[PDB]
Amino acid sequence: PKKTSFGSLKDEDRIFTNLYGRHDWRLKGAQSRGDWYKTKEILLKGPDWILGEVKTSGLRGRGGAGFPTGLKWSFMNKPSDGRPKYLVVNADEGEPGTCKDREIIRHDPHKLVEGCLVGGRAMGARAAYIYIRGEFYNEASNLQVAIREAYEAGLIGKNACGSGYDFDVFVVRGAGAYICGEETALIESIEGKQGKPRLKPPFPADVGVFGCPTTVANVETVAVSPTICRRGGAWFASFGRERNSGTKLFNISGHVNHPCTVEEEMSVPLKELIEKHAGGVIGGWDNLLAVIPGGSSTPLIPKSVCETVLMDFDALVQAQTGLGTAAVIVMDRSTDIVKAIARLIEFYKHESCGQCTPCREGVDWMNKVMARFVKGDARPAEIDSLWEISKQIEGHTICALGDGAAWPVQGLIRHFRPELEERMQQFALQHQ
Amino acid sequence: GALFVHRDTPENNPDTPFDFTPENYKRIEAIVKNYPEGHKAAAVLPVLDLAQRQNGWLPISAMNKVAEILQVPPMRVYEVATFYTMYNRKPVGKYHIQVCTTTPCMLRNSDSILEAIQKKLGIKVGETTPDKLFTLIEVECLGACVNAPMVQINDNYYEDLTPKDIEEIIDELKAGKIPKPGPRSGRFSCEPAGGLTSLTEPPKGPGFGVQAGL
Amino acid sequence: SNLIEVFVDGQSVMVEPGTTVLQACEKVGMQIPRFCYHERLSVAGNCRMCLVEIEKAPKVVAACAMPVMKGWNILTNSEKSKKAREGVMEFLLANHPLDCPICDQGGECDLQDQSMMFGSDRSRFLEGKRAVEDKNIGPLVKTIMTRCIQCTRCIRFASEIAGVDDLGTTGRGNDMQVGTYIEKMFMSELSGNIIDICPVGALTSKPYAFTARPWETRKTESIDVMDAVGSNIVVSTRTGEVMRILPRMHEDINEEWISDKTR
Amino acid sequence: EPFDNSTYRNLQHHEYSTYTFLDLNVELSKFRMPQPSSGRQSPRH
Ligand SMILES: Cc1cc2nc3c(=O)[nH]c(=O)nc-3n(C[C@H](O)[C@H](O)[C@H](O)COP(=O)(O)O)c2cc1C
Ligand code: SF4
Ligand code: SF4
Ligand code: SF4
Ligand code: FES
Ligand code: FES
Ligand SMILES: [K+]
Numbered sequence: 001p002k003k004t005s006f007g008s009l010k011d012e013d014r015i016f017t018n019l020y021g022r023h024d025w026r027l028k029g030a031q032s033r034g035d036w037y038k039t040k041e042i043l044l045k046g047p048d049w050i051l052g053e054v055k056t057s058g059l060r061g062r063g064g065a066g067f068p069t070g071l072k073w074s075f076m077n078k079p080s081d082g083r084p085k086y087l088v089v090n091a092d093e094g095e096p097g098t099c100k101d102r103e104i105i106r107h108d109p110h111k112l113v114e115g116c117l118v119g120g121r122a123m124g125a126r127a128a129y130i131y132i133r134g135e136f137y138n139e140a141s142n143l144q145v146a147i148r149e150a151y152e153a154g155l156i157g158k159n160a161c162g163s164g165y166d167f168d169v170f171v172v173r174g175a176g177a178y179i180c181g182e183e184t185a186l187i188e189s190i191e192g193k194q195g196k197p198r199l200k201p202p203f204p205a206d207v208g209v210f211g212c213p214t215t216v217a218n219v220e221t222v223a224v225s226p227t228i229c230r231r232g233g234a235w236f237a238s239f240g241r242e243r244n245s246g247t248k249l250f251n252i253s254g255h256v257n258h259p260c261t262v263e264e265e266m267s268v269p270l271k272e273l274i275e276k277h278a279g280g281v282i283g284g285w286d287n288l289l290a291v292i293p294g295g296s297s298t299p300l301i302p303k304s305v306c307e308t309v310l311m312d313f314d315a316l317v318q319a320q321t322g323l324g325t326a327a328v329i330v331m332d333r334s335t336d337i338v339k340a341i342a343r344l345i346e347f348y349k350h351e352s353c354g355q356c357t358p359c360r361e362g363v364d365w366m367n368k369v370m371a372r373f374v375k376g377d378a379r380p381a382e383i384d385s386l387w388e389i390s391k392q393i394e395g396h397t398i399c400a401l402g403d404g405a406a407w408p409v410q411g412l413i414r415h416f417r418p419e420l421e422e423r424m425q426q427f428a429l430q431h432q
Numbered sequence: 433g434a435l436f437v438h439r440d441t442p443e444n445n446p447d448t449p450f451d452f453t454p455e456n457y458k459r460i461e462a463i464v465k466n467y468p469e470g471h472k473a474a475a476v477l478p479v480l481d482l483a484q485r486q487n488g489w490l491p492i493s494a495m496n497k498v499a500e501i502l503q504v505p506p507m508r509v510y511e512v513a514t515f516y517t518m519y520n521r522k523p524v525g526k527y528h529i530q531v532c533t534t535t536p537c538m539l540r541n542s543d544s545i546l547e548a549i550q551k552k553l554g555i556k557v558g559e560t561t562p563d564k565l566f567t568l569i570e571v572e573c574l575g576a577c578v579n580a581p582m583v584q585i586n587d588n589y590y591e592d593l594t595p596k597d598i599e600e601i602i603d604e605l606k607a608g609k610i611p612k613p614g615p616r617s618g619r620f621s622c623e624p625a626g627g628l629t630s631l632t633e634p635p636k637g638p639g640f641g642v643q644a645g646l
Numbered sequence: 647s648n649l650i651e652v653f654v655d656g657q658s659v660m661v662e663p664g665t666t667v668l669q670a671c672e673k674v675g676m677q678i679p680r681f682c683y684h685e686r687l688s689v690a691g692n693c694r695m696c697l698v699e700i701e702k703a704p705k706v707v708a709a710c711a712m713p714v715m716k717g718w719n720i721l722t723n724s725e726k727s728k729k730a731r732e733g734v735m736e737f738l739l740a741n742h743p744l745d746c747p748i749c750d751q752g753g754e755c756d757l758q759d760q761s762m763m764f765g766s767d768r769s770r771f772l773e774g775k776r777a778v779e780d781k782n783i784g785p786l787v788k789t790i791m792t793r794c795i796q797c798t799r800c801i802r803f804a805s806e807i808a809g810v811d812d813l814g815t816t817g818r819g820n821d822m823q824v825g826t827y828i829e830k831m832f833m834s835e836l837s838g839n840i841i842d843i844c845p846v847g848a849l850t851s852k853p854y855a856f857t858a859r860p861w862e863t864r865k866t867e868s869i870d871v872m873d874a875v876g877s878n879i880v881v882s883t884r885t886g887e888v889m890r891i892l893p894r895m896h897e898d899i900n901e902e903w904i905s906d907k908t909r
Numbered sequence: 910e911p912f913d914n915s916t917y918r919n920l921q922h923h924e925y926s927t928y929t930f931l932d933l934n935v936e937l938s939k940f941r942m943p944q945p946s947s948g949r950q951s952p953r954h
Contacts, residue, residue, distance in 0.1 A: 022631075022916060023918055097573075102576065138613070144930060148933060152940075177516055177517070201713060210468055335539065354818045356691075357693050358737055361737040362740075364820035392733030436821065437823070437825065437827060438827050459928070459931040465944065510816060631914065
């Protein structure tokens, strides 16, 4: 009837079966692994049926925010006012701890291409723009080899798959900016400007890239869709809990015996992931200090919280953190957590686009303050100031980079204030 | 330094000789036709990247050439040049060593790789070797966090380095030959080092979990 | 007759669709704080000084860029709106130079006035401030660029009103700087208008430098005779001496601009 | 033909060059649809 322990996903129900590149990644291998199967029928069922199945699966955003996919994709169901419509696949993957998108674009690129076709048909888009980060040169070239095979086989382009739908897939490499993972900053980076995010009340579904209706989607969100439509949608919904449904790619990095990328059933306990797939934290589970669950934006949790937490959006939101990109960065007890969070804040300072005052000035301010916190060169009355500054950045910026910089600070202050004050007191004792 | 104001030098000035080779102009033409008519300013980033891949870096003459080719204002090309960190507005070495030093790589001792590089090259972070073969900088996340500390030399990823593997990579780099990218340990791409805790069975054939008529 | 009904602190106003929160507050006589927003320029929405609370909405909105919705109640003086303004002003003043006595903007700044009216009265910034090198864009505009708050008003004006795409931003983050990258003059008949739109002393008039303070000048409203446009101007005088020329708004003739010969 | 999850199958990117991606784009220009047009040649036109 119902599930209560959402783990131990089998190989049969894993979407990304060429995750480690141990099979052919080209068209011939991908076809034998189920790809590009009855795509003509999926397209001919119509956009309404495809979107209905994407809603039935309960799939949410796999690139952070986790907004439901079927509802987001249905903003394009409107009739055309003359302007073109595009699907913009987000392949930037700039979040520290996250390397899951990199693995699809080079070992299952045809999954991404056919997901582009299925989704763009669902949104009624003429072309797909895959914006990959410029650092993924080999992955981008693998993706474009796959796109070339899809074109030469008639699966993309004129009369795509025999459906009569005309669809193009263009790859546009980035040039070294993490802010270009943000959907509107990505849009403006496609348009040849600085990667600065736009103010939202004009939404990408109305005014997107080139000023046309667009939907920006993560690589995994796009790539799972052909298996969602071809396997049932109900089949996808039978994995994980309610709301947060399906399966996810997990990046386990940090103080782990076997850091790895694995596909595990959603709502999996963090313990099962770390022990079964990652081989456990070095020194055992007793040696665990924090774990950052969903990439650098998601605030850390302590070992007590991480002891009995489940890996989905709702369970991790209950734990004052987020699921983010399902990039778990575990830290053993031999870790300077203040140094780690200061390094993350330094990353966010280096990646701020500088457009808006709170991110531009405040993230730099928080980096300056956190650098002192590593040395202890501060008074304990500055911790509350750091909290207030982070809340002043949070909810006051154009994009979510300010929020994702303020959140690691809050997660450090929330669970490791004694360590910060201990460092400050040691510094006061050393420097009289 | 990385200053965001240009100053003319006898090497970097508007009259610095730069132009695209005919093959690069054909590649530019293929790039320009990827975007709708009236919106070809969307090609500034890839055309600038082609300028960098031909010349090695971006002199101000290359920026002006891209602006002329796309009929965008030069200041618009200047903004893109100074915003995206992959654009070399100063010459770099033959091999641009880029070591990731953010937290997931730092926890795997990315500093033991940085110190080995600084010891072998006899150079610091942010400067080139006198033979103009290696430039060393610290970069943010490169999307390879699962692999132990990694570097990007030019276009390739060298992963899970020990303070000895990067020495060998630099040794064969100085010997001219290019090294095989990827993880230098026994693992292949991103799987667990002890064995596959995941897909280990023949993948299902085409049309396995289908429904009705799809 | 297609006007929608919105509320500004409970008071109902009827606005055309597409009217922003800032404009809806403007028609009840309430001026939302702003730095980057100019009504004659495009909307940027970057300074975040116009953030305001929509009743029942957890997240503040940029009043300058957000179109009003039917039934919205703008809370222009709620505590959340005041705290947003105080945080934004704190961030604006974190790296701002302590140049008020030596800066020509002092006494008619905007940063000063909105710090007094909407920000806190004290600092908790305990670090070293930013400093950027000056840019030379001709003999008319003195760019003390470390006073710049990156509102992009000059860039938007130069690109749209003046039609010259010389101004811009280089770099990103905290070290993103407004300028021309290259050493280049900002020559245009309308170049001197980026001085007035600049909210701070980042862009100042070279001829007027160090010469007068705003409070001591007498303002005579007159007409320009350097051309046949008849631009409306204000003549600043002090102790019987003409001090400078400023634009005087006339929507039908010159709006709020004058040419460099007029100025 | 048999199961071969004991070997990497992504060895092509070892032989990629500086112009592999752009050459692939060039060869891709063959089969694309005609781009849409906004009517003008540039927003400054
Ligand atoms: C700073 C920043 C970086 C982001 N980077 C990425 C990224 O690399 N990949 C991604 O898929 N989404 C990224 N996102 C999230 C996108 O903005 C967007 O919400 C998402 O791509 C939408 O598609 P989804 O609903 O399928 O996730 C980023 C967001 C922010 C604020
Ligand atoms: S939050 Fe930061 S990255 Fe996002 S628009 Fe504002 S300044 Fe740019
Ligand atoms: S611009 Fe305003 S706040 Fe800044 S120094 Fe000048 S008078 Fe003071
Ligand atoms: S120079 Fe003045 S007008 Fe231009 S961005 Fe800076 S503060 Fe705004
Ligand atoms: S942390 Fe070094 S690659 Fe992402
Ligand atoms: S005035 Fe609306 S953000 Fe600057
Ligand atoms: K000014």
